[PDB]
């Protein structure tokens, strides 16, 4: 006799979404009883080296342990994935999402309810890419118009005093167009502890004190981080540096950062839950984010953060930049306010057809 | 009014005759749509001076917050109890349990599945409280139980307990042995007992809370000894205790009891132990089938529990309940629980 919760099929297709392309995967699990969960891989090679083919390979590699398994055992499966030779972060994520979506779709259980039900809405910020000063203000005007109050500002790359004075020029113009906006700085591993600091003074001169400097120094520079953090003048967030419950434990231990940025696409859900717990207990604050993701990975991210509650920073903006939306359902935007109340089973997102 | 809304928070005496008597409380939430969930508060006055009545008030006082809330928001409710006026740890557990049991009963979702479904059975030990020692060891193995928890606690007085565990070893020479120090030794004293234990060639599986709740430097030096594995019991109560304990490498094993701080708090503890590589034991107070089943659903669900101390429904003269976990000697099966923890009043 066949148990309804048994996983019959793990399938995957490309999910290339045009911008203005994002090479993503759409993962699907089906239970012997007919229910389907979906999940999405959004590998970002520039971020960690992993690619679509590599994450595509991993998902196929995982059929061995996923198919035949019970969806009710999402935790022993999640823990089994890493051991597969080809395994990658964003497949862990897409697989785990697809499994939890099936489990909860079937149970008629909002995914945000699964994650705790602390909240059912979020207030997202919106990112401004690094370009000209004109574009920064132009962007900032569109933001303000939307009703978004926090804005994340990209800067650097991996430096001078002129590159900094240009990055500084942008931030000024942006504050001018948004005088009461909460500002986040996204260093993106492009600063030295000193360089990072020099700039904070230029910004201090013009009367700007960022609400957060996210990942000023480089990934392996948990010393610059620790450093910058000690000069208690701007909250420092670990992004690239934190990608496991273990990094998170260490970061907290060495007082390297004030804020942890969680991304399900980096490590998956089961792991994120542990990072969440470690941050809570160490009293580090939480940012939620993502790669280049559609409504699917981004909804799951909001159901995670709202469900859990306790996230000071929410950076779930990418579906505002995509030029297509291949999905039915999922979270809803009202200005900068993400609404989850219409999600009644799983994460509510399903593929459409033309 | 959404079907998921809590219509009524309820509590009733749950007095179960000790095969003394356990003065517990049966908590119950009822949802608009008719769904009922259950929780159990088993306060232990001898432990933290919390009482059946003290916790009864806590639960009723919680009606203001709980009644009218949505069971879909188990986590925010749960994070909020602590402040309610007169809140008792065991009523936090009983409430949270009742709430989760309603959410997952309604969703035809076994609790162990909600907790991850890592496993679906566990293997429990049984406790022994000097002739009286071997008398217990004998019936235990005649139950098929392979782990034995020996409660214990002058060089003389160690001698006596040594004669005990040696009497139990001679009777069941292959069974895994836990020592339940119970904040009853100083470090030098404990080691002294280990020494006089490794003479008869006895090394216990675990030494549970050898020192006082406050001597986390005692636990610590015992643990650097790297001889026997040391578990924190009374010393670990919150996610914060757990994180400190782990930072200072004070112990090897953390003993979770849901009845102490509730389920949400317990999840964070498990998580902190896991990332630090500490091992876990799951226990309880004097709980009935209900709290003991949630406890199993928690451990089996999260998986990764080396020690399972869930025996109290055995020392019990009556069972007011239907369903839940089943015993087969020392093995607990959750396999037959289809919705919530599957426990209900008789």
XYZ file of C-alpha atoms in Angstrom:
700
model
C 0.000 0.000 0.000
C 1.230 3.420 -1.106
C 1.379 6.225 1.464
C -0.131 9.517 0.152
C 2.791 11.519 1.538
C 5.422 9.503 -0.325
C 7.353 11.548 -2.872
C 6.845 10.072 -6.353
C 8.735 12.547 -8.532
C 11.424 15.185 -8.273
C 11.567 17.156 -11.509
C 13.243 20.359 -12.642
C 13.077 22.741 -15.590
C 14.841 25.969 -16.401
C 13.328 29.211 -15.197
C 15.002 31.955 -17.145
C 13.371 35.257 -16.252
C 14.186 38.349 -18.345
C 15.411 41.528 -16.647
C 15.009 45.273 -17.318
C 18.174 37.170 -17.980
C 18.255 35.297 -14.652
C 19.185 31.650 -15.131
C 17.022 29.960 -12.512
C 15.576 26.491 -11.957
C 12.020 25.518 -11.061
C 11.944 22.402 -8.878
C 8.801 20.317 -8.384
C 8.014 17.411 -6.099
C 4.832 15.376 -6.404
C 3.364 13.128 -3.731
C 1.829 9.763 -4.589
C -1.502 11.389 -3.745
C -1.175 14.147 -6.321
C -0.129 17.213 -4.351
C 2.700 19.327 -5.715
C 5.217 21.489 -3.946
C 7.455 23.890 -5.844
C 10.745 25.547 -4.991
C 13.210 27.693 -6.878
C 16.961 27.666 -7.374
C 18.423 31.102 -8.016
C 22.176 30.467 -8.255
C 24.216 33.627 -8.705
C 27.669 32.655 -9.999
C 29.132 36.062 -9.122
C 28.105 35.537 -5.494
C 29.677 32.157 -4.726
C 30.606 30.457 -7.976
C 27.579 28.172 -8.272
C 25.674 28.084 -11.564
C 22.430 26.872 -13.110
C 24.006 23.717 -14.593
C 25.725 23.009 -11.290
C 22.484 23.388 -9.303
C 20.636 21.501 -12.043
C 23.155 18.702 -11.610
C 22.646 18.663 -7.828
C 18.866 18.333 -8.033
C 19.188 15.338 -10.359
C 21.821 13.963 -7.996
C 19.294 14.180 -5.163
C 16.486 12.183 -6.769
C 18.217 9.188 -5.185
C 17.235 10.180 -1.655
C 14.231 12.465 -2.287
C 12.121 10.155 -4.445
C 10.628 7.393 -2.289
C 11.002 9.535 0.827
C 8.116 10.834 2.930
C 7.341 14.547 2.771
C 6.589 14.308 6.520
C 10.306 13.719 7.087
C 11.505 17.003 5.608
C 14.192 17.272 8.257
C 16.041 13.991 7.682
C 15.981 14.684 3.951
C 17.286 18.230 4.406
C 20.107 16.823 6.530
C 20.880 14.161 3.912
C 21.350 16.549 0.977
C 24.713 18.152 1.854
C 26.450 14.750 1.681
C 25.750 14.305 -2.033
C 28.933 15.106 -3.993
C 27.482 17.696 -6.376
C 25.222 19.354 -3.783
C 24.874 23.146 -3.871
C 23.288 25.788 -1.655
C 20.562 26.869 -4.073
C 19.460 23.308 -4.756
C 19.303 22.562 -1.041
C 17.026 25.577 -0.946
C 14.813 24.738 -3.938
C 14.495 21.098 -2.855
C 13.666 22.018 0.746
C 11.192 24.670 -0.350
C 9.460 22.223 -2.706
C 9.192 19.666 0.097
C 7.817 22.055 2.702
C 5.433 23.483 0.106
C 4.025 20.023 -0.559
C 3.775 19.166 3.140
C 1.951 22.403 3.957
C -0.029 22.686 0.705
C -1.526 19.359 1.636
C -2.137 20.346 5.257
C -3.768 23.639 4.243
C -1.216 25.533 6.297
C 0.210 28.871 5.275
C 3.993 28.573 5.127
C 4.274 31.697 7.288
C 2.148 29.796 9.799
C 4.514 26.860 9.585
C 7.400 29.200 10.409
C 5.655 30.599 13.482
C 2.998 33.109 12.485
C 4.693 35.972 14.329
C 3.561 38.308 11.553
C 1.780 38.225 8.176
C 3.267 41.335 6.588
C 6.699 42.922 6.190
C 8.187 46.276 5.277
C 10.739 45.855 2.510
C 13.478 48.195 1.382
C 14.517 48.616 -2.247
C 17.995 48.455 -3.750
C 19.745 51.166 -5.739
C 22.528 49.921 -8.034
C 25.864 51.684 -8.413
C 25.768 54.043 -11.388
C 25.850 57.794 -11.929
C 24.718 60.355 -9.362
C 21.787 61.344 -11.576
C 20.514 57.755 -11.667
C 20.847 57.392 -7.888
C 18.503 60.330 -7.333
C 16.246 59.285 -10.200
C 16.043 55.871 -8.557
C 15.528 57.411 -5.119
C 12.615 59.451 -6.464
C 10.893 56.345 -7.834
C 11.450 54.717 -4.442
C 9.928 57.535 -2.415
C 6.997 57.547 -4.840
C 6.395 53.855 -4.108
C 6.161 54.429 -0.363
C 9.369 52.607 0.518
C 11.102 54.163 3.534
C 14.337 52.171 3.695
C 16.717 52.117 0.740
C 19.759 49.925 0.209
C 22.647 51.614 -1.585
C 25.222 49.564 -3.521
C 28.854 50.757 -3.462
C 32.449 49.796 -4.311
C 33.455 46.357 -5.634
C 36.827 45.194 -4.265
C 39.514 51.444 -4.513
C 40.629 55.078 -4.160
C 39.526 58.380 -2.643
C 37.791 59.359 -5.881
C 35.767 56.154 -6.204
C 34.738 56.858 -2.617
C 33.932 60.504 -3.259
C 31.745 59.381 -6.158
C 30.042 56.763 -3.982
C 29.701 59.519 -1.384
C 28.292 61.877 -4.004
C 25.578 59.322 -4.753
C 24.584 58.791 -1.109
C 24.236 62.528 -0.552
C 21.932 63.075 -3.530
C 19.968 60.064 -2.292
C 19.541 61.418 1.231
C 18.473 64.740 -0.269
C 15.690 63.057 -2.232
C 14.960 60.926 0.848
C 15.678 62.968 4.021
C 13.768 60.673 6.392
C 14.566 57.383 4.660
C 16.418 54.666 6.538
C 19.654 54.088 4.633
C 21.509 50.799 4.270
C 25.021 50.595 2.838
C 25.872 47.453 0.854
C 29.672 47.280 0.877
C 29.654 43.993 -1.028
C 33.171 42.972 0.066
C 34.752 46.063 -1.471
C 36.364 47.859 1.448
C 39.277 47.640 3.823
C 38.529 48.321 7.489
C 40.215 51.759 7.030
C 38.762 52.638 3.610
C 35.376 51.547 4.932
C 35.997 53.909 7.834
C 37.293 56.860 5.818
C 33.986 56.914 3.937
C 31.870 56.831 7.105
C 33.484 60.147 8.030
C 32.819 61.780 4.677
C 29.227 60.722 5.282
C 29.447 61.955 8.869
C 30.598 65.334 7.587
C 27.558 65.632 5.319
C 25.480 64.569 8.323
C 24.730 61.032 7.135
C 24.895 58.096 9.550
C 23.813 54.899 7.734
C 21.319 52.656 9.529
C 23.610 49.773 8.616
C 26.822 49.003 6.758
C 26.399 45.563 5.223
C 29.616 43.641 4.555
C 32.150 46.485 4.160
C 35.297 44.340 4.191
C 35.989 41.076 2.364
C 34.521 37.619 3.024
C 37.618 36.291 4.800
C 38.129 39.519 6.725
C 36.238 38.593 9.901
C 38.848 40.839 11.505
C 38.013 44.032 9.648
C 34.410 43.220 10.496
C 35.250 42.619 14.157
C 37.261 45.834 13.930
C 34.663 48.102 12.287
C 32.141 46.739 14.792
C 34.165 47.786 17.845
C 34.128 51.451 16.823
C 30.432 51.321 17.772
C 29.346 54.010 15.268
C 27.393 52.144 12.586
C 25.772 48.689 12.751
C 27.793 46.126 10.761
C 26.067 43.217 9.031
C 27.647 39.975 7.855
C 26.390 38.784 4.478
C 28.885 36.797 2.393
C 30.709 35.835 5.575
C 27.721 34.118 7.200
C 26.519 31.069 5.241
C 26.086 28.435 7.946
C 24.864 28.103 11.514
C 28.568 27.629 12.155
C 29.776 30.903 10.630
C 26.953 32.538 12.545
C 28.031 30.993 15.838
C 31.598 32.160 15.235
C 30.640 35.682 14.124
C 28.524 36.082 17.255
C 31.309 34.622 19.392
C 33.930 37.080 18.119
C 31.531 40.037 18.230
C 32.332 40.529 14.552
C 28.952 41.940 13.499
C 25.752 43.430 14.918
C 23.515 42.048 12.191
C 23.247 38.751 10.314
C 21.838 38.645 6.800
C 19.981 35.390 6.184
C 19.425 34.055 2.674
C 17.626 30.750 2.234
C 19.258 30.409 -1.212
C 22.666 30.206 0.466
C 22.069 27.303 2.848
C 18.414 26.261 2.779
C 15.622 26.485 5.336
C 16.553 23.934 8.021
C 19.931 25.664 8.245
C 18.475 29.183 8.231
C 16.288 28.236 11.186
C 19.462 27.482 13.135
C 21.135 30.704 12.051
C 17.951 32.482 13.151
C 18.073 30.832 16.589
C 21.758 31.656 17.062
C 21.204 35.316 16.166
C 18.201 35.611 18.474
C 20.073 34.081 21.406
C 23.274 36.057 20.875
C 21.149 39.141 20.403
C 22.368 39.799 16.893
C 19.782 41.491 14.680
C 18.409 39.906 11.522
C 18.289 40.984 7.907
C 16.477 38.825 5.376
C 17.531 38.832 1.738
C 17.900 36.860 -1.449
C 19.730 36.484 -4.731
C 18.050 37.242 -8.042
C 14.756 35.509 -7.253
C 11.173 35.502 -8.505
C 7.967 35.624 -6.484
C 8.516 32.031 -5.397
C 11.840 32.206 -3.550
C 10.930 35.695 -2.335
C 7.553 34.648 -0.929
C 9.136 31.722 0.913
C 11.639 34.249 2.267
C 8.865 36.527 3.582
C 6.934 33.608 5.078
C 10.188 32.748 6.802
C 10.908 36.217 8.203
C 7.295 37.063 9.092
C 6.592 33.558 10.357
C 9.652 33.784 12.596
C 9.298 37.476 13.344
C 12.290 39.442 14.564
C 13.804 40.848 11.385
C 14.916 44.485 11.582
C 15.885 44.640 7.926
C 14.006 43.113 5.025
C 15.497 43.244 1.538
C 12.940 41.415 -0.602
C 12.793 43.638 -3.695
C 13.915 41.711 -6.813
C 10.417 40.978 -8.202
C 10.136 44.761 -8.539
C 12.948 44.623 -11.111
C 12.086 41.506 -13.129
C 10.403 42.130 -16.463
C 8.234 39.003 -16.322
C 6.264 37.051 -13.739
C 5.850 33.351 -14.575
C 3.805 32.610 -11.468
C 0.296 32.653 -10.053
C -0.119 33.463 -6.375
C 2.378 34.355 -3.675
C 3.061 37.476 -1.638
C 1.676 40.854 -2.576
C 3.184 44.346 -2.702
C 1.447 47.505 -1.522
C 4.031 50.230 -1.873
C 6.859 48.764 0.163
C 4.540 46.626 2.257
C 4.625 42.886 1.595
C 1.264 41.230 2.305
C 0.946 37.499 3.060
C -2.653 37.191 4.256
C -4.008 35.691 1.024
C -1.653 32.698 1.246
C -3.746 29.853 2.661
C -1.731 26.734 1.781
C 1.988 26.247 1.269
C 3.486 29.448 -0.125
C 0.623 29.911 -2.582
C 2.861 30.084 -5.647
C 2.277 27.892 -8.716
C 3.447 27.978 -12.390
C 1.034 29.373 -14.974
C 1.262 28.252 -18.631
C 0.795 30.636 -21.599
C -14.414 34.914 12.812
C -11.760 32.778 11.092
C -12.015 29.034 11.887
C -8.483 29.215 13.273
C -9.458 31.665 16.014
C -9.183 30.447 19.598
C -12.652 30.463 21.158
C -11.719 29.215 24.624
C -8.658 28.606 26.798
C -9.421 25.970 29.431
C -7.746 24.204 32.359
C -8.777 21.403 34.714
C -7.121 19.412 37.495
C -5.041 16.491 36.239
C -4.331 14.449 39.363
C -2.625 11.140 38.603
C -1.910 8.580 41.376
C 1.756 7.560 41.463
C 1.904 3.772 41.106
C 2.388 10.027 46.102
C 0.279 11.883 43.536
C 1.057 14.098 40.535
C -0.895 17.344 40.737
C -1.014 18.287 37.061
C -3.242 20.424 34.845
C -5.009 19.521 31.622
C -5.040 22.618 29.414
C -7.254 22.808 26.329
C -7.791 25.289 23.530
C -10.924 25.215 21.414
C -11.006 26.871 18.008
C -14.022 28.538 16.429
C -14.275 25.692 13.910
C -14.574 23.164 16.744
C -10.991 21.913 16.796
C -9.670 21.046 20.248
C -6.016 20.858 21.272
C -4.541 19.698 24.565
C -1.539 20.538 26.718
C -0.305 19.425 30.131
C 1.275 21.443 32.934
C 3.245 19.306 35.364
C 4.761 21.759 37.879
C 7.272 20.382 40.365
C 7.400 22.382 43.621
C 10.334 20.387 44.949
C 12.279 21.693 41.932
C 11.574 25.414 41.468
C 8.838 26.020 44.018
C 6.217 26.192 41.297
C 2.837 24.721 42.217
C -0.283 23.211 40.657
C -2.297 26.231 41.794
C 0.331 28.796 40.867
C 0.252 27.511 37.278
C -3.532 27.199 37.229
C -3.716 30.942 37.783
C -1.114 31.581 35.075
C -3.191 29.740 32.488
C -6.461 31.499 33.364
C -4.634 34.833 33.512
C -3.437 34.033 29.981
C -7.016 33.933 28.660
C -6.743 37.641 27.909
C -3.957 37.058 25.381
C -4.726 33.549 24.108
C -8.508 33.722 23.707
C -9.288 35.541 20.474
C -5.865 34.933 18.929
C -5.265 32.797 15.840
C -3.691 29.392 16.329
C -1.803 30.100 13.081
C 0.304 32.493 15.129
C 1.616 29.972 17.650
C 5.033 31.647 17.706
C 3.971 35.197 18.590
C 1.544 33.996 21.234
C 4.339 31.811 22.608
C 6.933 34.587 22.668
C 4.434 36.705 24.571
C 3.489 34.520 27.475
C 6.597 35.132 29.463
C 5.386 38.604 30.334
C 1.839 37.860 31.172
C 1.392 38.492 34.868
C 2.108 35.435 36.984
C 3.446 33.318 34.234
C 4.756 29.899 35.171
C 7.165 27.920 32.993
C 5.009 24.805 33.035
C 1.962 26.769 31.916
C 3.950 28.130 28.999
C 4.629 24.559 27.987
C 1.026 23.498 28.515
C -0.367 26.446 26.564
C 2.102 26.233 23.665
C 1.499 22.488 23.473
C -2.296 22.882 23.408
C -1.959 25.543 20.695
C 0.393 23.501 18.484
C -1.760 20.417 19.029
C -4.769 22.321 17.710
C -2.958 23.762 14.701
C -1.567 20.371 13.644
C -4.609 18.307 14.592
C -6.709 20.446 12.292
C -4.118 20.038 9.519
C -4.044 16.233 9.775
C -0.352 16.651 10.518
C 1.451 14.448 13.056
C 3.398 16.529 15.561
C 6.626 14.649 14.937
C 6.177 15.678 11.298
C 5.802 19.319 12.378
C 9.091 19.000 14.272
C 10.874 17.654 11.191
C 10.176 13.920 11.107
C 13.847 13.018 11.499
C 12.751 9.752 13.044
C 9.530 8.137 14.218
C 10.545 5.985 17.155
C 12.952 6.403 20.055
C 14.559 4.084 22.576
C 14.020 5.153 26.180
C 15.871 4.437 29.396
C 14.311 3.856 32.804
C 15.330 5.425 36.113
C 16.210 3.768 39.408
C 15.610 5.781 42.579
C 21.096 -1.133 47.691
C 19.032 -4.286 47.448
C 16.337 -1.986 46.066
C 18.782 -1.284 43.231
C 19.161 -4.767 41.745
C 15.442 -5.378 42.324
C 14.798 -2.627 39.788
C 17.591 -3.525 37.366
C 16.045 -6.987 37.019
C 12.555 -5.920 35.935
C 13.992 -3.242 33.644
C 15.953 -5.683 31.476
C 12.962 -8.016 31.659
C 11.269 -5.173 29.788
C 13.929 -5.126 27.083
C 15.292 -1.749 28.135
C 18.989 -1.240 27.368
C 19.620 2.116 29.036
C 19.468 2.589 32.781
C 19.363 5.912 34.609
C 20.720 5.592 38.142
C 19.675 8.436 40.418
C 22.214 9.193 43.164
C 23.264 11.552 45.956
C 31.174 11.708 52.370
C 33.661 9.215 50.933
C 31.426 6.761 52.773
C 28.281 7.940 51.059
C 29.799 7.629 47.601
C 30.815 4.118 48.651
C 27.142 3.335 49.140
C 26.065 4.612 45.734
C 29.051 2.760 44.247
C 27.736 -0.432 45.807
C 24.441 0.426 44.097
C 25.587 0.998 40.521
C 27.925 -1.984 40.907
C 24.936 -4.049 42.016
C 23.081 -2.863 38.911
C 26.059 -3.535 36.631
C 26.441 -7.100 37.913
C 22.737 -7.664 37.208
C 22.658 -5.976 33.785
C 26.302 -6.043 32.560
C 25.577 -4.755 29.058
C 23.069 -1.966 29.690
C 24.093 1.643 29.067
C 24.387 3.524 32.377
C 23.432 7.145 33.006
C 24.384 8.791 36.293
C 21.948 11.414 37.594
C 24.220 13.491 39.842
C 21.431 15.960 40.525
C 23.554 18.916 41.688
C 24.846 16.653 44.445
C 28.643 16.779 44.198
C 31.627 19.077 43.984
C 34.039 18.417 41.118
C 36.831 16.723 43.144
C 34.104 14.600 44.750
C 32.633 13.447 41.436
C 36.013 12.539 39.928
C 36.679 10.682 43.166
C 33.620 8.543 42.370
C 34.672 8.014 38.757
C 38.051 6.818 40.027
C 36.423 4.418 42.479
C 34.212 3.391 39.584
C 36.964 2.677 37.066
C 38.330 0.160 39.541
C 35.444 -2.236 38.937
C 35.842 -1.354 35.265
C 32.666 0.724 35.134
C 32.429 3.771 32.892
C 28.944 5.333 32.663
C 27.463 6.492 29.364
C 26.797 9.929 30.808
C 27.175 11.877 34.022
C 24.059 14.025 34.368
C 24.421 17.264 36.341
C 27.062 16.203 38.903
C 27.595 19.665 40.404
C 25.341 22.445 41.708
C 23.202 24.561 39.384
C 25.645 27.438 39.912
C 29.045 25.745 39.537
C 29.478 25.974 35.752
C 33.216 25.913 36.395
C 32.715 22.576 38.104
C 30.797 21.155 35.162
C 33.602 22.713 33.133
C 36.627 21.047 34.718
C 34.797 17.707 34.792
C 34.223 18.189 31.068
C 37.845 19.066 30.258
C 38.633 15.820 32.062
C 37.274 14.286 28.849
C 36.771 11.121 30.883
C 33.005 10.626 31.034
C 30.511 12.846 29.100
C 28.805 15.488 31.262
C 25.242 16.713 30.796
C 23.721 19.972 32.033
C 20.248 19.610 33.521
C 19.277 22.240 36.087
C 22.131 24.401 34.802
C 20.421 24.765 31.414
C 17.011 26.457 31.328
C 16.988 28.925 28.440
C 18.536 29.377 25.005
C 20.928 31.727 26.804
C 22.037 29.197 29.433
C 22.610 26.758 26.580
C 24.703 29.274 24.631
C 26.825 30.217 27.647
C 27.351 26.570 28.608
C 28.532 25.920 25.046
C 30.801 28.972 24.836
C 32.644 27.926 27.981
C 32.610 24.271 26.895
C 31.028 23.506 30.264
C 29.327 20.279 29.194
C 28.995 17.673 26.443
C 25.245 17.106 26.638
C 22.247 19.405 27.171
C 19.087 17.957 28.727
C 15.955 19.528 27.281
C 12.697 19.479 29.249
C 9.809 21.152 27.440
C 8.029 21.585 30.774
C 10.748 24.027 31.854
C 10.465 26.854 29.309
C 8.061 25.614 26.645
C 8.551 24.485 23.048
C 9.685 27.624 21.211
C 12.412 28.143 23.804
C 13.323 24.452 23.484
C 13.728 24.606 19.685
C 16.336 27.363 20.056
C 18.167 25.267 22.649
C 18.331 22.245 20.339
C 19.590 24.546 17.572
C 22.315 26.043 19.777
C 23.487 22.605 20.914
C 23.538 21.382 17.336
C 25.729 24.177 15.994
C 28.097 23.781 18.918
C 28.196 20.014 18.523
C 26.773 19.384 21.981
C 24.719 16.200 22.282
C 21.140 16.162 23.538
C 19.029 14.328 26.068
C 15.265 14.706 26.276
C 13.547 14.463 29.632
C 10.569 15.625 31.622
C 9.183 16.196 35.082
C 6.485 13.905 36.408
C 4.466 14.006 33.201
C 1.655 11.815 31.933
C 1.306 10.212 28.530
C 0.397 13.616 27.094
C 3.526 15.608 27.913
C 5.672 12.512 27.354
C 4.286 12.091 23.839
C 4.950 15.711 22.917
C 8.446 15.184 24.317
C 8.962 12.172 22.047
C 7.450 13.939 19.037
C 9.981 16.683 19.706
C 13.039 14.443 19.929
C 12.072 12.006 17.171
C 11.104 14.972 15.022
C 14.293 16.991 15.433
C 16.326 13.790 15.556
C 19.816 13.777 17.008
C 18.979 12.828 20.576
C 21.587 10.478 22.028
C 19.797 10.061 25.376
C 16.080 9.518 25.852
C 14.705 9.793 29.378
C 10.952 9.391 28.896
C 9.771 6.810 31.411
C 7.364 8.553 33.836
C 4.121 7.136 32.394
C 5.363 3.741 33.639
C 5.381 4.726 37.316
C 1.740 5.697 36.911
C -1.309 3.886 38.315
C -3.841 5.284 35.826
C -4.084 6.799 32.338
C -6.916 9.299 31.649
C -6.021 9.470 27.977
C -6.549 7.961 24.531
C -3.880 7.415 21.883
C -0.384 8.873 21.751
C 2.931 7.029 21.816
C 3.099 3.321 22.565
C 5.797 1.381 24.403
C 7.362 -1.901 23.328
C 9.833 -2.543 26.087
C 12.208 0.391 25.870
C 11.103 1.404 22.389
C 8.668 4.241 21.816
C 6.721 4.206 18.552
C 5.136 7.412 17.226
C 4.227 5.728 13.938
C 0.522 5.594 14.643
C -0.072 9.282 15.513
C -1.903 10.907 12.568
C -2.842 14.420 13.759
C -1.396 16.686 16.426
C 0.266 14.645 19.165
C -2.769 12.373 18.878
C -3.554 12.487 22.599
C -7.110 13.038 23.881
C -9.146 12.709 27.098
C -10.712 9.349 27.919
